[PDB]
Ligand binder design. Structure first.
Ligand SMILES: O=C(O)CCn1nnc(-c2cc(Cl)cc(Cl)c2)n1
Length: 134
């Protein structure tokens, strides 16, 4: 109850740093990187009971995940990886781990001031994506 209150809402991407390099490290191909990197998605976060839903709506590829914290699920990513995901809350940060093909990437979502800051890590490469309220 009230676990993700400050995440709930509709958010719009306003800045990105190092996302191309993050995608390269993940293994995303050229054409997907170029088109995906243009997108300015809206991220829509909602909670109903124990179920959290995160939607991403963009000109590249709409996605939607629903999950319970700590409970692994199947996810098809925007770049079409078939991953096994687990999302937990760690000290007020949503921590999303994706596993596929013996690889792993972690996406952290945090509230900072009036922004939602998304940090994506693959090995030594980090990308920071900043969202504001839509
Ligand atoms: O939500 C955000 O801004 C960042 C979290 N995030 N959402 N989508 C992706 C993504 C998309 C593509 Cl096409 C490739 C790869 Cl490796 C990751 N990462």
């Amino acid at each position: 109850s009230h676990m993700c209150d400050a995440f709930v809402g509709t958010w719009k991407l306003v800045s990105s740093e190092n996302f191309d390099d993050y995608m390269k490290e993940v293994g995303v191909g050229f054409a997907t990187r170029k088109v995906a990197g243009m997108a300015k998605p809206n991220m829509i976060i909602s909670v109903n009971g124990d179920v959290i839903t995160i939607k991403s709506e963009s000109t590249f590829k709409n996605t939607e995940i629903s999950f319970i914290l700590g409970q692994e699920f199947d996810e098809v990513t925007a770049d079409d990886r078939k991953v096994k995901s687990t999302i937990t809350l760690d000290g007020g940060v949503l921590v999303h781990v994706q596993k596929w093909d013996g690889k792993s990437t972690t996406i952290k979502r945090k509230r900072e001031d009036d922004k939602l800051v998304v940090e994506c890590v693959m090995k030594g490469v980090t990308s920071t994506r900043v969202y504001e309220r839509a």
